[PDB]
């Protein structure tokens, strides 16, 4: 399990007799937590904390907070090959749109193909950054999972009379995004976000005094995800 976990993930460790292993994500001084380094995914790291911690076997599941609460996507093209876990979980509860745009290919768990011997688990939120009623969520599957016996575990938390008003709005969010008429909402939100980022730098130099600053690189002319390089000073991550 990742260190930057949600309150819902805390009760999960208190109901299952398991031995979790916490990571050490990167961080700066402003409070914005970075991400898990690439050294924590190697083969010499997974089995490193297993022998040191008493009563621990081979990890069969990994929970990765991608993205975090602030919105920082990781690199799934390197985790799906280096991290030797047959059940990698991606907490994509804040990015229900990494598909309807070409600037998100190879950045999430759903982008790409089926990993041999592994499976991708994503619990993308529905009533957070979409358009549906409350108490709605999705479970994405990229590979082979369970359904017959797994349905018994789903009924342990869901009553026998589900509210169809939420189910009808849950599938509606998947239909409002299909087609070119739905893809304009993702690209339109990015264009309005980049325009808002340029208005801050424009009203900063021309102003007479202090002004707000956006945590962004010095070059924002492109329309894509700005990578966090090692020769920059805007991110401040050592």
């Amino acid at each position: 399990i990742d260190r930057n976990c949600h309150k819902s993930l805390t009760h999960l460790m208190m109901m299952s007799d398991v031995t979790p292993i916490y990571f050490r994500p990167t961080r700066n001084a402003y409070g914005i937590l970075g991400g898990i380094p690439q050294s924590e995914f190697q083969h010499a790291t997974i089995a490193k904390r297993v022998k040191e911690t008493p009563n621990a076997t081979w990890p069969v599941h990994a929970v990765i907070t991608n993205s975090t609460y602030d919105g920082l996507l990781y690199n799934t093209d390197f985790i799906k090959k280096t991290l030797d876990v047959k059940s990698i979980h991606f907490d994509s509860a804040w990015v229900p749109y990494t598909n309807f745009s070409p600037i998100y290919e190879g950045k999430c768990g759903m982008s790409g193909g089926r990993v041999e011997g592994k499976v991708i688990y994503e619990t993308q939120s529905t009533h957070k950054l979409l358009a549906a009623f409350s108490q709605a969520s999705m479970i994405h599957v990229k590979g082979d999972v369970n359904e017959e016996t797994f349905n018994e575990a789903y009924m342990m938390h869901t009553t026998t009379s589900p509210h169809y008003g939420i189910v009808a709005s849950t599938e509606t969010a998947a239909a409002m995004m299909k087609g070119n008429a739905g893809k304009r909402l993702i690209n339109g939100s990015i264009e309005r976000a980049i325009k808002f980022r340029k208005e801050i730098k424009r009203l900063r130099t021309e102003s007479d005094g202090w002004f707000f600053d956006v945590w962004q690189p010095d070059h924002i002319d492109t329309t894509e995800c700005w990578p966090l390089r090692s020769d920059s000073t805007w991110h401040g991550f050592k």
Binding site: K48, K51, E52
Partner: protein, 479 residues
Amino acid sequence: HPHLLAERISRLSSSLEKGLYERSHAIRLCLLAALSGESVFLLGPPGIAKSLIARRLKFAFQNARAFEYLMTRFSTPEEVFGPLSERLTSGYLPEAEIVFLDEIWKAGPAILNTLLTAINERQFRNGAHVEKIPMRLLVAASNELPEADSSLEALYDRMLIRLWLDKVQDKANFRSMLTSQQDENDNPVPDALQVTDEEYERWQKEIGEITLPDHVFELIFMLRQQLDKLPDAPYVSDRRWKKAIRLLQASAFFSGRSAVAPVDLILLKDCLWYDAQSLNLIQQQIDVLMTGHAWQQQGMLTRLGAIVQRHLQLQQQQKTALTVIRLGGIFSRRQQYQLPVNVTASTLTLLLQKPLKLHDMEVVHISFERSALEQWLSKGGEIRGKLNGIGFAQKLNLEVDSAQHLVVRDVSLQGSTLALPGSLPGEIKQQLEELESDWRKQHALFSEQQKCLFIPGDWLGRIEASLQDVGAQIRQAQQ
């Protein structure tokens, strides 16, 4: 009988040191490997007394043979073990006891393949079958270091002790060394200190009979996990850990002890590194382990620091009030919790400021029950408490105060804040003497096993300084 063994060994190495100054670590370590069946490796520039130690330890026995050989780039196996006629091995290595091999990092591939079979099994092929070798001490010196990816690393990973010799640096020890009159070819060892062949075969079996205490295993297993946390630490296989147990059991055997002593872990500084980069990493982690987990150095620091923080907290509690804390959780009514370590009795008494007329009588102290106070402050209801420590537990009109106190109401709706009776506080002195007594118990074991001959002298200045640092700090808070 076991106590007299440490005195005979101390007198045997006394004559061996006479003639080689600043070389006590290179002579005393070779004696332990000779009486236990181990090896030793030396490293340094040619001319720092590396070949005399192989010819000096032979005088401590009665049937020893020397063999000073120099490996070259064109050396042949027939010139090392003996030329064949079946091999004429008259005074070489298969029948010798102490052999010397200088510049071992330059022999041929056939020589290295024969040196690997004469260590694990003490055997050597002779045309057809093999034969036993009465080898007692194996020493090897050189100058340079081998490659990182070569066939010469198969022999280095099998040796136990890796000595680190260097030229002289002290000026006082160089005056007598520059003009020394002690001969290096005589017999300075007396005839009464030399062991026989019968005593050697008996000591080889009594080494494995040394018991392994549970406190010693907690330090050896922790050191193995500490090296794994550092990626730059040298890789150590399971073969070295099996031979390291015999090294510690043999050190405490000749020191008048029956079990493995925690001080024997100092010899592990020359059994893990392999080059100059890993030399500063092995000696650093062991120094922290010996001054942090051996005699519970850090174990006393985690308890002394809490006393200093507790001493500053009791300054505002020892005029006297009683602050009630709120217990955590999601409950409807605002529940309250008692005091933790401050009060521990069951039928404790509580004082009060302004006296009240309860039950048509005066009272100066009211005692409550600990088993009944925890239930009323959580599940609610009514509290029952006696007056003046006598009578039955009568009911009172006790409620919660805005400033976290206990206001006792009567028939006139009057307030009365309750408080606990008061007494270097007593709690600080009680918790400090228990930690101070543990320091004398750990120092008592160190003030008995320090006479071990197989311990370097430079480590006595760091282990003793670590124990005196905690003692100098624990005696400051009690002033």
